[model samples]
Target chain A: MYQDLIRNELNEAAETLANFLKDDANIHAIQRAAVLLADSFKAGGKVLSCGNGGSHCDAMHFAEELTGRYRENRPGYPAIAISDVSHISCVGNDFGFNDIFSRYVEAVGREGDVLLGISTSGNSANVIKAIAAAREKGMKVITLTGKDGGKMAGTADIEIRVPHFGYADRIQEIHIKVIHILIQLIEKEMVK
Target chain B: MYQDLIRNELNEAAETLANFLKDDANIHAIQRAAVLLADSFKAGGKVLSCGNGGSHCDAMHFAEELTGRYRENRPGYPAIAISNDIFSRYVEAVGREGDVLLGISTSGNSANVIKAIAAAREKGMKVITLTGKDGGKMAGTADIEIRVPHFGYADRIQEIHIKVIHILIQLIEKEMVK
Candidate 1:
């Protein structure tokens, strides 16, 4: 039956998790990211996330988790997805494709703010550029990537590198969980 | 200074998950939601996710995964985030009995989502909801409701909600595409 395909997908997720939890690859980076994100919000700084098309959807989800209620009622945390359509439309046409997020980061990111860049391949030029721009603004950088983290492996101060590659959706499965975990972490600290 | 706060919150999250799992160890609402959602998509029915705030983001995420790409590169499936804007009207105009609507709300009582759910039911479509606290009105209305086991803990509950959506999508992609 079609159940085999689903079974395969579950195994992929399990395999990724097994390696991600191995001795060398761990969740410490995610912990560090949660701390920084919490600090930024406490200091009244904002968070801006960026990614390519599919990843952009994640960026939006991340922002919304904060801007909308996460679990409890607290004032909405300040967050934005740099890849929002209208915002992208403003910069996507004139500038090079890679500069879209960077342009937004340059304009809005401030010192102590946080930048969450998502790229399954970890080599999306646009997200990399956004990180650089955020760096220029003295913002902290956290990246979520798959496999070897691609070119983005060495780019950010903290990278939640899922220990598998060649499987974008598998990596994304982990990415969203990490995002959810951080949301719980960040919100509990920021509000309570 | 803030590290202590972070650590404390981490413990709280651990506590919440521990309780949620213990409460539903034998039958997880998460797994049931996936099966129902997969069946809906398998029947060639499209998915429509609606919510007011954070749930809307989850809706967008779910819709994009299906309409854009979930795991493997199949043609984009027709999925829409009904709360994104005027798009819900367009979706409702063409919805049928076979479609599925995923309503998300912390209180299970977002008016807009309720209206969307009502519309879905009226069209003979199934309504699957991800909600928390007491599951509010949706606890009774949704065809298959996955409720996060906590009240007033909005952030914690929504975290589980996102995980559920992600899991269901992974299942739907595999079962439908392959």
Candidate 2:
């Protein structure tokens, strides 16, 4: 039973990656995101990320890869996960839960900063608010969503929609893989 | 100009409803952090936070409010800034900064959290970590650092740091705050 489950999971993950590569629009957006992030780093800009629940984990994970090192011995860059307790609670309380990211962008964000929002369902209210705020602030946005890509598909400058629905865990698993690949691609293209 | 700057930026922020009015503590150990956060939201536990460069903007500012209140409506809770990113970058940027809050805490002598605990020792807020090492600076600073257990993995450290935060928040919403 365990073997079957593991096989199924791996298959799903592989298929998701394959589908992601096959979608021309998705490929273009992924490439655009990589180039934008590389440019931001070259220009000494930071990448800020945020999300809710499991997607929040993905945001922090990506930030870690950027600021620490995705592979080995590479130089650390500037990246931040903006969904801390103080910021989230303050924003959630002062504005609304949905405006947490929006308010943080206003207070601390600047142009050339890249804002990454992760939402499995593609319709987290707070995530949407944050993307809008980032755009208004003239910052670039890269969104990772699941299924139909929700409202974020239309709004984000670059959107990568994980090609699955129903299960949150599966969506998150694919999200991490795509992010890892994207980071690797960016590193290869820029860090040489 | 400096005086006005201090007043407007520092004093005004200090006087804000979110900063002054909230639960507090003054214990010298992780127990204090756990108690303060746990009590504030009725046993929902603590959340960890960390970051790099301008990311520290999120960590420090967020710590200030979580330890206090974000605004008048939001209740304050217990939190600790891992200060790893601060130390690493500061060391790189300014060369050997002062003994970090995490360092002191790991040595079982957290002056800042202890100082904050003085006001509300009885109100327990569960201590959580936003740090690098298992028992480095923040190891003893809070109830848990979520222990990345790996050296020089600041990004992984930070990634798990936010996961811990999000999980704690979900627990808070589902159990206590809800």
Candidate 3:
């Protein structure tokens, strides 16, 4: 039976949540991120998110929730995931993979906008580069990282690092959970 | 301060996990789902997943974990999420018998997802639906239905669904390696 293995896995995820919620810093960081996102949307500025691999998927999820409906039906917010195939390939192939996200940030990111960068290792070259680009453009940065926060530590206006290490999947579980909560908080701010 | 709201939201997610784990049916369904997916891979069948909006993101997330590395480094498996496309037509074009279709609809009533589920069935593929709210229209349409036992909010349901997706991939990796 797969019962034992399944139980252990589920418990590990549950345990991560338990440990994460016990820290007040995590909650406050999420609060700061929600406010930053809400403020960006209110100022007629958009939010852009970027990452690599599974983190890229998390970025896409975060963008759609903002533009599409989360729990309430509202006007579409301007949120973009830096995931255009042609643009990515054009920039990555021409410059390098490390320049893809940063180049996109340079193209459309405005002064009042915000960039939400996700890197589990907190060391994705492209995400780090994009963080710099956003800063140069006078945009706020929020990063989701785990495992000592990698090089992405202190690189964001707000950093909600999952209180875990090593396993990307476990860290990603918490990341997605944070994404959902942020979406919910933003919805509450915009709707009422 | 947003502490109260954040705490409640975090607690809701934790509570959902507590309630979900209390049910033997939920665990068994996940086990069956792992078995079905593992079997399909063993028979050289790929997985095709479809959904709309945020669910579509979940679909994409699920597909990548299978094709790329999960917790372990194994050979890449065949899995595709039909994103930013007309799904039924895509499924008809690529899906074959014995393949698996993972259809996610939080409401279980999304018309496009329902139509794609039908297309998957017509291709002789087994369907595994991840849904919420009494399974909506998607009840009884799958070889395995992993419905989140919740009503009202889709966010709660989706939080559980992603956790399930994470667990499914982990179980699948274990099965593949064994």
Candidate 4:
């Protein structure tokens, strides 16, 4: 009885998000992300994608896809996740929590590059700061957020909102799906 | 030249997946996965998820949501992504009957993922796999198989696979939240 109340709320929050991909508008945004990633790579520009917690893993996954480029058969592309432990500890220690991602974005990002910030709630302070830094450098800012896009909706040049309000966990699930879509899109284009 | 080609191709692959989700069966499958995950946690079963490369990241991501409790405000769940560690040894150490083992291999043949699946079964653990392209050998082996079509769209397939895993966890969270 004690846990069921919060538990049921949690259930609805997630079940609601499990199938958010049926929307046409939601599908279109990822196309834009794919395009953004492709165009940046074509111009020989680097990419930086970041997020906290589970979303941070998506950031690292994106970088891994590019790092696969310098292969026996796969030439490497330039992509980095500011989620690196080195970057996090150094920046968080020197600049505090909020500056963790932003300082890295400021240091590693350049005009014509790209920064992808992921936050299911769309309000992780570090993502907000990284976005600000990305914009300051004239780099393209893209975000993957859930539930009406949080404050990040307004900050990104291209925003892929998962179209939810309460299912933070499911919203995050969608971000990982979108991450692969972008990669598939990029891979398809690059090979073509 | 490469830019235009990739951009256009990217657009098309994305649109295909867009249409793929329109089918009620595909969408409902995730909900079913959700319930399965929920049932597993409810019964006090632990979950072990594993993969390689990007999918490896998904494995870690899935494990973290459980370990971090996914904002469910509860103690960590027993989930681990067995990466780079000694596979057989890890199984020997923690494997148990009634635990859940999840394997993701786009081709169904990541040597280690399958080995994990085999070890899981040997330990009497149930196996679930997320794969594509005929589900490879993994289909026959897994207790449950979530297979996406489009044989070579490794990225889309994996993207879909991870989504399945996440929704399952979300569904688990609803029931498990303290």
Candidate 5:
């Protein structure tokens, strides 16, 4: 049974890799995004990531890796996940849901900050609004999305799509793998 | 200069909106994810979120929202941020980050549930985990993750990504909204 479970896990990993490989164009886009993120960090810019639901978790995950350490101990990069209860609720209660992210961006974002918007489908209303707000504040927008890439694709300066219409489970799995790879790549190119 | 800045802001918002419209395919996927989260909360499951540094702040943000109110006043949903300095230091001193979200997600396959379950099982506290995929060992350990399918690892580290958490909070609040 244990062997079977291990085999199944391996199969899942392999299938995910296969799917990722199939999306070569998106992969290339992510590579470019990695370079962009590294450059921004090196230039003393902070990374801000946000998303809804599972994507929200992704926002925090990426921030931890970039701001803390991906693999090796490097200089801590300044990054913040704009999705917070104190901030979001205050904004949503005061300004409405659409303005939550936008309001936060206005308050904290500065020129050269990197704003990362994560949505598997790419059309989260608040995320779209936040990206707009970030851009207005002179922040660079990087989006991680999937399927047709949603509306965020065109809006973001750098858009990396995971290319799937599967369940959130599958999409989330891919999101983790992709992010891990991005962090590893960034660390390799920047940390040494 | 002010006119240029105002014009620039408007231009930027328009550009972002235009770009977001370009990726129409992702809209449905996100919507479906939102519904799932609503259903999860409806089932009486709690959301547990945590991370290091800024991510920790995000975790606390969600926990507070759930414990208090997201949009409107409603019965608090059980949510906890496992990265408290007092708790973290105590756990570390005791050689048991496992007593917190660490062991639950990384060791127990339910990262969010680590501290929650520990608190629950040990002291009769109830909680869950809201975390990223590959939730380290927490994935297997937690009851669930409002999981967003993506590969941007760092994206999961911050709290802003808890858009799902907000959505879920709203979804549940909507029941109250009515």
Candidate 6:
């Protein structure tokens, strides 16, 4: 019984990703994002990311893969996800939830740095504000979103929006896959 | 310069998952693990997950998806990723016998994950490992092992891990709600 349920979900996941792969534009979009990230690392800058809920976890995952390790054993890259509880609690209490990520961006983000904002809905208010803050700091912004890209569309130096019109799970699978590719591209640049 | 590069990488990711779908055992493994999670929650037990590096992010992603929301509107479930250090101690401190621990490692040989598995066993907790590359030391150590069929490349392995994490949560949601 449960096997059938799981099997369908797994098959959908594979199909969703396979459909995503059908677009050459998606590949080009990822390449543009990768170059932006590679250029940031080359400029002695770090990458910072932010999102809400599952997207927030993607933000963290993206950061750790950079600072921890990808496939290669190169020196850890400089990347941070805005996930510290105290900072979030403190900022969210005083500045409101929308300011949580933007506040962090204003505090730590500098020119030449890169900011990656993820929102499956493409309209997460906090992530949008973070992109605004990143812009003020001269940081390049890259956004990953689904379903028409929401309000976050066209608001990045490079935006690789998942072309799926479905739920966050399918969008997130592509998000993580793109995250891995960006790291691989960045790793190639850093190690060389 | 990067168009061909990213194109190839994305194709590889799709192919890796397509190959994984070829095996029915992988689907069953996920089903068993989902049932374990549903049973544990039914027993008023929570879930604790642990991993290193990229896998740790997968662990964190898993916890938040359960505690936050999946698709349907449902009450948040109890799931925590063993982060901020000391995997075994954290497990021993909070993990009870009926709870579940989702340990993830691409290599399956992460010492901390191995140690956390030992601690979970000590507490009589059920273990579910999401691993790859021959399942390593974690091969025979879990109630269910959802091992990705790929033999190398942590990126390839982790892509499947995230999918499994998403599916497990979806299954648990289906069982628990309506």
> CA lDDT of B109 in candidate 4?
72
Worst 10 residues of 1 chain B by lDDT: B18-27
Runs in model 2 deviating more than 4 A are: A1-15, A69-77, A85-97, B1-178
Q: Kindly list the per-residue Cα lDDT of model 4 for residues A74-160, writing each as its tens digit.
A: 334578888554555543332224677887887778899999888888878888988888889989988988877777778888888
Candidate models: Cα lDDT each:
0.70, 0.52, 0.83, 0.69, 0.54, 0.82
Instruction: For residue A91, give model 6's deviation from the true position in Å.
Output: 11
DockQ of each: 0.16, 0.02, 0.63, 0.18, 0.05, 0.68
lDDT of 2 by residue, B64-161 (tens): 54555322344434444446133333323322111122222212223343443221222332334444444453344344343433354233333333
Output the better candidate (2/6) by lDDT.
6
Q: Which residue runs does candidate 5 get wrong by more than 4 Å?
A: A1-17, A70-77, A85-97, B1-103, B107-178
Collision count of model 2? 21
- In model 1, where do residues sit more than 4 Å from their true spots? A1-27, A38-45, A64-78, A84-97, A180-192, B1-45, B69-77, B84-94, B105-111, B131-136, B144-178
| Tens digits of lDDT, candidate 6, B30-135 | 8889888888877778899988877887898888667655423433357888862389999989888898899999988988888888999999899999999799
Could you give candidate 5's per-residue lDDT for residues A110-138 as a string of tens digits?
A: 89888888877877788888888888899
Estimate the overall C-alpha local distance difference test score of candidate 6. 0.82
Give the top-scoring candidate (DockQ): 6
Q: TM-score for model 2? A: 0.49
Candidate 5 Cα deviation (angstroms), residue B98: 21
* Colliding residue pairs in candidate 1: A70-B154, A70-B155, A71-B153, A71-B154, A71-B155, A72-B153, A72-B154, A72-B155
lDDT of 2 at A171: 68
Instruction: Name the candidate, 5 or 6, with the larger DockQ value.
Output: 6
Model 3, span A57-152: residue lDDT tens: 789889977877632443445788996555555433322246778888998899999999998888888888999999999999999998889888
TM-score of chain A of 3: 0.88
Ranking by lDDT: 3, 6, 1, 4, 5, 2
Worst 10 residues of 3 chain A by lDDT: A88-97
Compute each candidate's TM-score over C-alphas: 0.69, 0.49, 0.89, 0.70, 0.54, 0.89
